Amino acid sequence: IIFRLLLNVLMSIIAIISYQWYEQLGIHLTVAPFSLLGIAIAIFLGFRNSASYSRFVEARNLWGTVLIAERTLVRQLRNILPAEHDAHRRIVSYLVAFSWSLKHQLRKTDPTADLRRLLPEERVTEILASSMPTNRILLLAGNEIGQLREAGKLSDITYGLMDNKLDELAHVLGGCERLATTPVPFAYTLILQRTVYLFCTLLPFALVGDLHYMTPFVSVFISYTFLSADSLAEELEDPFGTAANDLPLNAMCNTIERNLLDMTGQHPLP
Amino acid sequence: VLSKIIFRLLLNVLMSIIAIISYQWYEQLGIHLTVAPFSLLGIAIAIFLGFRNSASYSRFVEARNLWGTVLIAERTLVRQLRNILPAEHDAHRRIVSYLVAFSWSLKHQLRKTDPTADLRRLLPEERVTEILASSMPTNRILLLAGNEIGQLREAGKLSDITYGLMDNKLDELAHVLGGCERLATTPVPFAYTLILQRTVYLFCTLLPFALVGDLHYMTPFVSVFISYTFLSADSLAEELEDPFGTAANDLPLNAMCNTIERNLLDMTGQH
Amino acid sequence: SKIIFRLLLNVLMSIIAIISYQWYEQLGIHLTVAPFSLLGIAIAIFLGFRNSASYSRFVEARNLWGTVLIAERTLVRQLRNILPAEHDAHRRIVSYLVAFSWSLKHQLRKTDPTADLRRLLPEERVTEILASSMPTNRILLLAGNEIGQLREAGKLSDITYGLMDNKLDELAHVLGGCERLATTPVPFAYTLILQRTVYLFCTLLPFALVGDLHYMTPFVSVFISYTFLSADSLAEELEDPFGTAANDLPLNAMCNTIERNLLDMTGQ
Amino acid sequence: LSKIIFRLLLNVLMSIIAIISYQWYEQLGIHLTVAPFSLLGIAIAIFLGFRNSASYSRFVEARNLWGTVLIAERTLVRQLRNILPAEHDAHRRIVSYLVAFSWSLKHQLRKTDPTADLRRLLPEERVTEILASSMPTNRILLLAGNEIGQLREAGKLSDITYGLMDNKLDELAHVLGGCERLATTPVPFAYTLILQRTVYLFCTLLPFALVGDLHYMTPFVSVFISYTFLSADSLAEELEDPFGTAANDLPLNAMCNTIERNLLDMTGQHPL
Amino acid sequence: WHGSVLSKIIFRLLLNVLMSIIAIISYQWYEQLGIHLTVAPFSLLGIAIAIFLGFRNSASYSRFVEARNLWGTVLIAERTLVRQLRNILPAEHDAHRRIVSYLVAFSWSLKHQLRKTDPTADLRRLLPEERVTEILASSMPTNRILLLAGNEIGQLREAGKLSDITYGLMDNKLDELAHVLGGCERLATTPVPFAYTLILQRTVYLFCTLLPFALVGDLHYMTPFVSVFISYTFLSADSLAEELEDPFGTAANDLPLNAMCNTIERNLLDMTGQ
Ligand SMILES: [Zn+2]
Ligand SMILES: [Zn+2]
Ligand SMILES: [Zn+2]
Ligand SMILES: [Zn+2]
Ligand SMILES: [Zn+2]
Ligand SMILES: [Zn+2]
Ligand SMILES: [Zn+2]
Ligand SMILES: [Zn+2]
Ligand SMILES: [Zn+2]
Ligand SMILES: [Zn+2]
Ligand SMILES: [Zn+2]
Ligand SMILES: [Zn+2]
Ligand SMILES: [Zn+2]
Ligand SMILES: [Zn+2]
Ligand SMILES: [Zn+2]
């Protein structure tokens, strides 16, 4: 980014010294065409940011739903089966493993320490064996519920009430996968990013006639505004990207683990 | 804050007086500032402020909506209790005290304030202790109300279906909780508003210099008009920053909690 | 409206600007068009977004009222389909749904619902309803009681009770939503600063145009002013959809439509 | 394109008047620069952008509601086949009500006579019942609901499976409600008609402010600009009524025909 | 950046450079004629066109996003239908395998239908020939696949191995898929209103044709270069709608439906131990 700003000031000085030689040749750059162009580019950057922002908000809503559905499902297990503490403890394990597994899957990092921390090793091997480990964890949680239903402890209705929450988590997994696997067609976005780059390099040659020595200052102010618009659009396109802020994901996984522990009577020391 | 915008309006007037005074020296030295580049930059900044303001506004509308749903789902949970168990008035009173405690607690959570007093007013001390030990008191309150209807289900007074009908309302509330906690911890990205406010400040400070060649002694008036408009647009979005905050523009959470409590008390024959 | 005033005041501002154009440079004041281009275009962006929010606020009100008709229609359909012989319960529940609509309309218009309520319900319930600070919620509660006593009497199962309970929820979200809209406006900081800015812009504009247009200034200025005043006025015009203005929902017509729909479904 | 080409060539006329009256600008003392009209024209374009957004939202919603007719009717028939596979007389009756519902909804939105379509589909007794209601699409929904209600009363459906079908009837009621709200409530006219008149006036005055610059080009760029602006305006006006009959409105007859072909796919036959 | 669109931008860009040459070597006979073109009207026109392009392309992009989302729902709903089968009927593997083959068949059939290709080989790889016959005799084969999966769980309900409740839990997923099928068919028959794209392509075409005659008086010999830059911005922005016209198509920025169907199949096989 600062490379393009500094390249901007040097095309500014090139513009200044080169300026007047080409102009008497009949080589003119005026401000009005570039103002037409830049206003068009700015409108497109508004919309492109709107889209990227939507993708960011969607990632945040999906994770929020992890917290809601996992909270609600443990609430249901306590309210409906208060005495099945072993089942509570097992299911809570799978729910926390699911959150961490999801975060590692999206960020493309190794889930093995979190899995091995939370789950028996037979099931950690079953999970790491699958090419879709988060989905497998959802399956295993489903098995705990379905076993409680075979054993008579849940009816089909209360089983159904919890099955809904496992559907809420399946909705989260697929949504996050789509958000991580494919970004908005950059087909238009790359074309627009290059147009922005060319616009900012040519800008000093369009401004020098008006601003003389002030050309590099105003030129980098304008170029800075535009390049920030384009780069924030790039950063928001990609909530799970390789250079993303991992703090709110890490914070979300920790919050839900703390909630489920504090919830099952395991958080407050005896 | 109003003091920021009047103070930087102040400063803009100053800047334009510097621009007026120094214009004579401006042309010999090689400096020229024309209006057209600042028209391009200003229109772009305005486009970006439109979109950002749209983000802020929609954050504030969502916060108001979530609270609307607190009132809706709590009203109908009490309605289901009365319609399904007309005789079970002890459960009526206890669940109403948990729903009311949930609302006040949500307010305290969002406001980062201590809910001990409201809890003690509505609940027996043992439950207050249980709720305060939790890292999420509103969650523990939803769990306790759920124990009320769950015990009703174990006594055979609720079937699995009517139990489930009320359980869903505790779902409507968990989603409100998640929504509010999400909004609280997820602002409009700081890069946006910080870069935007730096750009607006620099833009307004530089503007009178671009105006002076054209307006001469009119530079301060026009410059301050334009700057007022822009500083208004920028500050308004950060004035919708925390809808759960304390300020004239922020949601009146205390009044809304009183409306909720009044509603739930009205529905259970209480004064 | 205040538009015709501000337009005439704009004509006067423009005449002043013409007659005062002489002493302009004598005073040292120079005013071009380009700064006002910048500012007017920005104001117009902000007005387009603002009017957008106002518009969506109006749309949501029309939608909430649309859901009343949908949910009461299908609660009645479920009554006739699940208990086709229970006409006395038909009449009681329909009178509650219709009363809910008119009560909602009166509460939003801040009028007394008593005539409609007593026209629809027994006095014994009407007093319970108006004894409450939330009459429309109380009416929802009572309709719930009709359904619930049907369930206790074995006439509805828990399942078919639940399928009607869901429609009661559809109406609770409508009530809460309308009450929210009625007390939650698009932040009037928008509208106020924007309106002042539109006005000051409209009065200063001819002084910035006279140097370039001379005697033509009043026409271009009134045109531009009309456009900006028009947009600002529309945002103020769509702010309260539940009111009685020409641009507001025909709430009375809508309540008549709901009531005739449910009476047609019940033979009555 | 009836009104708009009339106004386009009327704009060629106004440009010609502007040209031959540029003769008199020097002597009458009238400058008319382009910058004030660029400002005003950009404001008008912004408002036309937003207005087209509102119109497009109405049109996309209308299209979606109709898509929900096909989805809900399809799954209701599917449930009837999966739950009561042998009840073909019920199959046929309910399907006839649902197809009737599509056509009835279309005629209601278009304000046309449904009698023919109803008669092609249902017995004449039910046709007169439906025609007697002032809400015939709603009455058709009530009648589909009576078919399901009977299947329940006869013990052929339990309350669960009855409810699974009742939900789809609710999906159709939200469609009816949504179309009625769209067809009877438009976008307010403080926008539409003040903005439309504003666009007209701007277009007629533009060439007068452009002769100063373009002299004989002013009819060409004036007509170009009026083309794009009048297009924006009339497009918004067309799409705000998406159940209308303009060329850019929804093809409701093709949608009803698709729905019919679906539910009656191979004389209504289906694998057990 | 695919076939039919790129050809048009290159041609209109060549049209542009040529119009700019003519403009340059003919500007000298302007004021003598009375034809004059200034930048300011074309700034008005260009900025109006750009606003309308912004809105339009916002529609096109939303349409692409919806197609992607509908396909993601296929994955989610089939995943959970299989999960439910395992958790409610764990011993009923035969039924598991049949229902899985119908769900995979549904995905492949939806791909073929949206590309208008022949589903017969995929269907015969997944299903017994009688089933393929039933499916392909329908005028709506993918919907018919849904009806057959409904029959599988309906038989499970008849045999008492599913209660009405749990039968209903899987029925809701079958109409999670019915929502997908209707949505794809609607998108496939409902573009962004062609009036938008056609009028926009025309005003952009004319605008880019007249631009160099409006820029020449300012830019002299620079006219071709920025005229082609500006024309690039407008032409490619106007091309976006056609790029995103066919999200179910086969181009590079067209959705990767075959890999998505492969992924769905691998997911269900993984879930059922095959
Ligand atoms: Zn426990
Ligand atoms: Zn699901
Ligand atoms: Zn802890
Ligand atoms: Zn509710
Ligand atoms: Zn939930
Ligand atoms: Zn009570
Ligand atoms: Zn009756
Ligand atoms: Zn009676
Ligand atoms: Zn009264
Ligand atoms: Zn559906
Ligand atoms: Zn049949
Ligand atoms: Zn409904
Ligand atoms: Zn001439
Ligand atoms: Zn198996
Ligand atoms: Zn393609």
Numbering used by the authors:
A (entry chain E): 24 to 293
B (entry chain C): 20 to 290
C (entry chain D): 22 to 289
D (entry chain B): 21 to 292
E (entry chain A): 16 to 289
Recite the paper's sentences.
Human bestrophin1 (hBest1) is a Ca2+-activated Cl− channel essential for Cl− transport in retinal pigment epithelium (RPE). Here, by electrophysiological and structural analyses, we show that the neck and aperture in hBest1 are both indispensable Ca2+-dependent gates, and their dysregulated opening by rationally designed or patient-derived mutations causes Ca2+-independent leak and elevates Ca2+-dependent channel activity.
By sharp contrast, cells expressing hBest1 W287A conducted tiny current just like untransfected cells, suggesting that, to the opposite of W287F, W287A is a loss-of-function mutation. Therefore, W287 is an extremely sensitive “switch” of the neck. Consistent with the functional results, no structural change was found at the aperture. Although the structure at the neck region was surprisingly unaltered, possibly due to the molecular packing effect in the crystal or the presence of Zn2+ in the crystallization solution which might stabilize the channel in a closed state, all three KpBest mutants displayed conformational changes on P208, Y211, and W252 (equivalent to P233, Y236, and W287 in hBest1, respectively), reaffirming the mutual influence between these three residues.
